Design a protein around this ligand. Structure first.
Ligand SMILES: C[C@@H]1CC[C@@]2(OC1)O[C@@H]1[C@H](O)[C@@H]3[C@H]4CC[C@@H]5C[C@@H](O[C@@H]6O[C@@H](CO)[C@H](O[C@H]7O[C@H](CO)[C@H](O)[C@H](O[C@@H]8OC[C@H](O)[C@@H](O)[C@H]8O)[C@@H]7O[C@H]7O[C@H](CO)[C@H](O)[C@@H](O[C@H]8O[C@H](CO)[C@H](O)[C@H](O)[C@@H]8O)[C@@H]7O)[C@H](O)[C@@H]6O)[C@@H](O)C[C@@]5(C)[C@@H]4CC[C@@]3(C)[C@@H]1[C@@H]2C
Ligand SMILES: C[C@@H]1CC[C@@]2(OC1)O[C@@H]1[C@H](O)[C@@H]3[C@H]4CC[C@@H]5C[C@@H](O[C@@H]6O[C@@H](CO)[C@H](O[C@H]7O[C@H](CO)[C@H](O)[C@H](O[C@@H]8OC[C@H](O)[C@@H](O)[C@H]8O)[C@@H]7O[C@H]7O[C@H](CO)[C@H](O)[C@@H](O[C@H]8O[C@H](CO)[C@H](O)[C@H](O)[C@@H]8O)[C@@H]7O)[C@H](O)[C@@H]6O)[C@@H](O)C[C@@]5(C)[C@@H]4CC[C@@]3(C)[C@@H]1[C@@H]2C
Ligand SMILES: CCCCCCCCCCCCCCCCCC(=O)OC[C@H](COP(=O)([O-])OCC[N+](C)(C)C)OC(=O)CCCCCCCCCCCCCCCCC
Ligand SMILES: CCCCCCCCCCCCCCCCCC(=O)OC[C@H](COP(=O)([O-])OCC[N+](C)(C)C)OC(=O)CCCCCCCCCCCCCCCCC
Ligand SMILES: *[C@@H]1O[C@H](CO)[C@@H](O)[C@H](O)[C@H]1NC(C)=O
Ligand SMILES: *[C@@H]1O[C@H](CO)[C@@H](O)[C@H](O)[C@H]1NC(C)=O
Ligand SMILES: *[C@@H]1O[C@H](CO)[C@@H](O)[C@H](O)[C@H]1NC(C)=O
Ligand SMILES: *[C@@H]1O[C@H](CO)[C@@H](O)[C@H](O)[C@H]1NC(C)=O
Ligand SMILES: *[C@@H]1O[C@H](CO)[C@@H](O)[C@H](O)[C@H]1NC(C)=O
Lengths: 339, 320, 339, 339, 320
């Protein structure tokens, strides 16, 4: 039903993302934490199709079919007010048993929200900046070959705009603010889900029973109707299993979110160390140890560098130089076709 | 374009939440649900009891007494809750539809024309700068007057403020109705239904009062409170986005002012004019324009303190 | 069932229109008046999912299940002939309670007929004429620049076909006849629906009851079967509410159609007053105050002008002259790029 | 429900892959191991549509319909706590019977995870690498013709970038690490599924019966209700058959995964032995017998080389040479058209 | 390409008919169908009788006696028949899938290269022929020796024979299974089911034997006989196709032999070699090649007996 039509929208929307603007680690986290609950609740609905009825009260044999159906329906709607159990104290919170499959829909919506906001808050700027930086690198590589080859012809500097742009971006702290707020919101929602599921699993172990009275308005002085109907909820075990599965999954997943929160630590490889090879590129080690957009930009560039055609060939040059062969760079540079 | 970062979110939430809620209500009714259930005596057979339930289901509209309150109470709201929400969804979606049919074409055309004019002016600047250099070795801002004229018109602002006012009014009506329903749907889900209407008035077998009880009142109450809290949280966003001029936090044209061919005009419209709405739209849509990006970096390079002449940097920018 | 099918066809056929040949106001009317009844029929059909059965008769306890089902269904099909109510005179029309959902489908069909016919009788001709007029205005604008620029070069008239075409169209009254007949049919259908819904609301307030007799063919001489079954229609209240909602909506909507009917009045802003600016365009105030196709053409143009490119740059020029700057039009005209 | 949805999803994601980045053997394994359980559980749900109810308890004749329904429901949800069987010891794990169609979905999700991780962690780099290698091979092939043709004209060396690229990729152990971890995870999941299904088949042969007591909360002092109901799970046989089928399929499939795990042994054919032929290509036998990315790259190129045009034409040249005809390679080289 | 005229029909019929038939078996149950139905005494209420039916439905797997035969009989086949056919369909469709994943790309590449080479050698002949006339007024056979070397290998043949053998073996298994089922599903659709298993052994009211009876055995019998006859008729087709060299009835390359630039080599492979399979594929795919159509006409013109020189007719053909 709602879970059935909720998973189509989220999964179909997800497939649009596949064909930059994301991360290798975060995307898995948001996929799992929003797909597992949806599948589990749709599955609970499948079980309800196979065999399932939330409540079932035991009415005496004198009652006909309709009277017993009325008893079941009444005790189904009287859960919200209060009802005593003959194994515990006065009352207990029982309506969690009614609304559990919808709390999971709420949690899925809340978990999906932060990624949507990020897509509506940081994708345009980041894609534009990455495209401009990659175009600048492609240009500056091309100028090197032109300058490189022109030197050979005689034998036989444009301002680093991208460098200044990155230097300026190093000062700002807006994109990092948004990308850290999104992760903090996701972690907080996951923690709330963890505590809620733990509490439910603790509760949904002893109090699925009932004692429901039907003498509300005019039957108070009736004689045929009995006092107490020992009703019992039926879909508590499935809910308990789903809750424990989700709790363990979120417990395992939370440390991943905690780790990925650390933007500066995640930078393990320096891509620009290779593009430093180009003579036209000034030697600047862009290892931003602080919380700056450059660090996030560096992490994004780590993923997106494979797209640019200059990286791989330039990398080959460093290996050739480091292999121990006394070959001048210009002979190797002219040995590289124009991109 | 033709929308906003904030307004689209508001029209999404305020029309999607009620739909999802009545959706899951119908899902609950699939799982287990029957609106009404009356307690008929044991003598009644199956069909007589079914008729009692049916009759008490339809006699709600006229009136029915409760043995805990005064004479009567409005109960048919319990029947009609899953249609009032559809009405609210329709009424909330109407304003954005009217906007799509009354302000999308004009805004699209004006934005495209403006963008083309800025791009042309940018190219003209390079030609003048490049031509000036060559010797060493003005086309009237149609766009400027276009925005100056639009500063005088007060039409699109009227439409875009009427739309927001209608949406806010409908949201407040929804809030108050849902609050009233939540207040009501706390004590009066019970019944006392009499079935001796037309000819059974003089029968003896049928009893007098059947203690019927609506069953889907708790779920409706929970959905009502959820909608009420969501709309209460959402309303201040609509009230804020109503104020157009205040939203103009950043002056994007301050960058295109850099171009020598562009006259230095601060288009900071503090009043309610079509320009201010236009400034809001250009702030969003400027990223589509290529000239903005390269011009902005020039200012940062110039603001870096380096004594590089703009002509030397201008010729270092390829033709877009 | 049928309504679910119907709303799919209309709204889908509507989405084709969204991507000239319409009007800002008329379209809202033909959308609302055909979307509300469909949605309410769908709501009733969904109500019949939660809880609903049109009729329910009260048969005595001696009757078994099948006999009571027969009684219910017989009284369901005996509505069409006549039946007495034990609060009124002889009879009353009760088959309106059966076919009410059919009537709303009929009204939706009849309300969507006018725009469908309009799309086959006035869309092609209007599109052709507007495209021709826009192309002619674009050409005459370009000719003006060429005449202006050539005049400047020296310092250092083609027939107005479109004007004659519009003058000729001013004399004809065909498109006006069609676009007024469409609105008149829509208004007449709305009025018929209003009166019908008002009569139904007046009716469906006192006579949802019944007195059914089942002694038709051979039971007339029987003994076990009783005489009168106090049957009662069930979905009368939902239909009453839907009728009142539709009545109030159509009462509010009718004045909009009344207003839009007055074609000459709707012409508020003279768009061609701006193309009057061009030196090549002859000064003709096309303020048609009579019922002529030109007025309809003017209305259809006023919306579509944003499509043209000459209007905007030309509107720019006029208000500089108003601004008070003594700049010659030729200098500004040469300062205008070719479109 | 979930199985119908899940099979549509998983298969739908599968179809996109069909139109490199996979293997002939691995793809079949990840198809079968995730398609069989889905189909089996979907057919189990269809079987339940035809005839099926998980549980059915035998209540005495005095009980009415609703009391018997409550007994059935109660005994359906009392499986989780504990229940005795009058053929065995005190208790036995019975809730596996309830959850067998849950565990198969869990196994399907776990099995399909590693392929998704591989696509999200080892698709793009390999794609770029193969593109670069094939482009370099095409260029060097073109260079060979130019040198050969130019030599004839007189009668009448660009640096090995790609070869050093492979020499450098020989020393890295990253993509091999990922591709071995994915296979190991899949094998571990398959083994866990095998052992679980074996244990279930062992269990689901003797303990589908029940002895269910109803006197839980207030009926403990009742007299009409009897003590024990001989309930019996109904869908145990179908689950047993599905379990044995899945167990045998996975037992047969596991050795395939174990065999394919060995990357170096799968390098049966030395495909670069053909590109050794070109005069411009250095004679380097890249028969990596260790666990190095080159081995994985060699395996992928053994599949993707058919995309390269130069292989086909070049392979024919050697076979012409091996036929025994004394034809100069230059005469045959000029007999080959430019690609 | 990547298929055959006869094989595709086989793999379509043999995997479509069982699917349609079991689709029909499921559909019939919508109209009327319930696999089992036992006869419980009148004293039993509704729920007790339902339990009897269910218990006898699941006790089929262990064993049950029939009062017309010996101790027991395999009865669970009646339960699983609409699943065994799904298994058979999966197995039948497996080999074509593997073949698509193991031989389609190689055949595609090789055929494409061969047709391109043939088109080239067709054009080159006309250029040589055209140049001869102008005066009046040899590129190495890559494709020929390519086919010569392919004649030596036996890989694509091994795959295309293993796939056919697997399909035939599965067909034979299905035939024998369906024959056995039809033999069985003619006398033993009845039951004698006892319900005194766990605690009712000492009970009194419950009777000893319930004469249950499976209901969906006749329809299964009809479906089984239909599938058996269809597969019996189909098997000889697969057997005939299994002989690769015999299928090469026509020598399509006999026409390309016409071109003077093409050396005369009769590629009539009488052995199990990739060339024979390649010849079979090329016979189907030759219509895609344009050189064949014109060339075949020239020989027909030549065979007409008219003394028209081939060069005069060769120049009468435009470039493709
Ligand atoms: C139940 C309670 C009470 C009642 C209620 O409340 C609850 O529920 C009611 C009910 O529920 C109502 C809804 C019922 C369903 C209705 C459907 C909807 O229209 C349909 O909406 C989609 C179906 O749901 C399809 O539209 C697109 O849906 C997908 C969008 O991604 C497809 O993927 C595809 O997209 C388009 O095509 C594919 C491209 O990749 C896309 O980028 C896009 O362009 C489809 O649209 C396409 O469908 C076909 C397949 O392609 C056409 O061929 C194609 O046209 C093409 O034409 C040219 C080529 O031939 C052109 O070049 C271009 O390629 C076009 O794509 C057409 O676009 C379909 O089609 C059509 O629009 C509209 O009636 C409103 C609607 C929602 C209703 C709104 C109001 C309600 C809710 C009611 C109400 C409130
Ligand atoms: C009852 C018994 C027992 C049970 C069982 O047995 C029986 O029945 C079960 C059930 O029944 C199962 C089936 C359910 C249905 C399933 C559907 C199937 O996926 C779908 O398969 C096709 C519909 O059936 C479509 O895929 C292509 O189908 C045709 C292929 O020729 C189209 O022509 C087009 O082809 C592609 O596009 C057109 C080009 O000309 C082609 O060369 C090709 O590329 C379609 O695919 C395309 O469909 C749309 C139209 O173009 C998309 O837009 C497009 O994606 C595009 O997206 C972008 C543009 O929008 C992008 O830029 C680019 O253009 C992309 O191409 C997508 O490629 C569709 O789409 C989708 O794949 C796959 O899940 C397996 C499937 C059969 C299942 C197999 C297993 C079962 C049987 C089960 C089982 C055993
Ligand atoms: C009862 C059980 C099932 C209940 C399912 C309930 C689902 C109802 C969904 C209705 C659509 C709501 C969409 C929210 C957003 C709308 C506005 C918007 O932003 O996008 C509009 C857009 C139109 O274009 P757009 O440009 O506005 O889209 C913008 C989209 N975003 C915001 C994501 C960028 O809508 C669509 O394109 C999609 C329409 C989907 C319609 C789905 C209808 C489902 C109806 C099911 C009703 C239940 C019937 C079954 C009854 C039970 C029987 C047993
Ligand atoms: C019981 C009532 C419902 C009965 C449903 C019966 C439908 C079963 C049909 C299965 C598919 C059969 C297709 C035959 C051809 C297969 C091979 C082929 O050539 O094409 C393959 C192709 C794959 O690509 P392809 O390239 O091989 O396709 C070639 C197609 N032709 C031959 C036309 C050129 O299959 C498809 O793309 C279509 C698959 C259709 C699957 C239909 C699924 C039906 C699901 C319902 C099953 C029953 C469950 C409900 C139970 C009832 C509950 C109340
Ligand atoms: C029961 O009904 C009587 C009238 O018949 C009423 O006076 C009395 O208050 C009722 N008893 C209780 C305990 O409510
Ligand atoms: C009931 O019926 C009797 C006669 O059968 C009549 O006198 C009396 O008025 C009826 N009761 C009412 C309230 O009309
Ligand atoms: C009444 O029934 C009897 C038989 O039951 C029949 O003979 C008679 O004709 C019936 N009355 C009339 C007026 O026909
Ligand atoms: C039944 O109830 C009485 C009190 O009502 C109690 O004393 C007795 O112990 C109960 N019997 C059993 C077997 O629990
Ligand atoms: C009667 O029941 C008892 C246990 O209640 C059991 O020991 C005995 O075997 C039963 N009698 C028969 C004949 O099975």
């Amino acid at each position: 039903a709602i879970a059935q039509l909720a998973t189509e929208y989220v999964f179909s929307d997800f497939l649009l993302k596949e064909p930059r603007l994301e991360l290798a680690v975060d995307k898995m986290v948001t996929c799992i934490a929003v797909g597992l609950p949806l599948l589990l609740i749709s599955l609970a609905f499948a079980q309800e199709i196979s065999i399932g009825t939330q409540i079932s009260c035991f009415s005496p044999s004198s009652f006909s079919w309709r009277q017993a159906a009325f008893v079941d329906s009444y005790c189904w709607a009287a859960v919200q007010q209060k009802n005593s159990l003959q194994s515990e104290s006065g009352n207990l919170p029982l309506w969690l048993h009614k609304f559990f499959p919808y709390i999971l829909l709420l949690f899925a919506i809340l978990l999906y929200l932060p990624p949507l906001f990020w897509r509506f808050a940081a994708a345009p700027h980041i894609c534009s900046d990455l495209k401009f930086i990659m175009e600048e690198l492609d240009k500056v590589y091309n100028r090197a070959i032109k300058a490189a080859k022109s030197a050979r012809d005689l034998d036989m500097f444009k301002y680093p705009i991208v460098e200044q742009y990155l230097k300026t971006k190093k000062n700002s702290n807006n994109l990092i603010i948004k990308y850290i707020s999104c992760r903090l919101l996701t972690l907080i929602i996951i923690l709330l889900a963890c505590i809620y599921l733990g509490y439910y699993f603790s509760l949904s172990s002893l109090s699925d029973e009932f004692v429901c009275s039907i003498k509300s308005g005019i039957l108070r002085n009736d004689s045929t109707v009995p006092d107490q109907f020992q009703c019992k909820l039926i879909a508590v075990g499935i809910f308990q299993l789903l809750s424990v599965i989700n709790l363990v999954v979120y417990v395992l997943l939370a440390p991943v979110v905690v780790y990925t929160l650390f933007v500066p630590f995640r930078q393990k490889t320096d891509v620009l160390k290779v593009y430093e090879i180009l003579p036209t590129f000034d030697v600047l080690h862009f290892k931003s140890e602080g919380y700056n957009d450059l660090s996030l930009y560096n992490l994004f560039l780590e993923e997106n560098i494979s797209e640019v055609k200059s990286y791989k060939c330039l990398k080959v040059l460093e290996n050739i130089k480091s292999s121990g062969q006394g070959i001048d760079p210009m002979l190797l540079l002219t040995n590289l076709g124009m991109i």
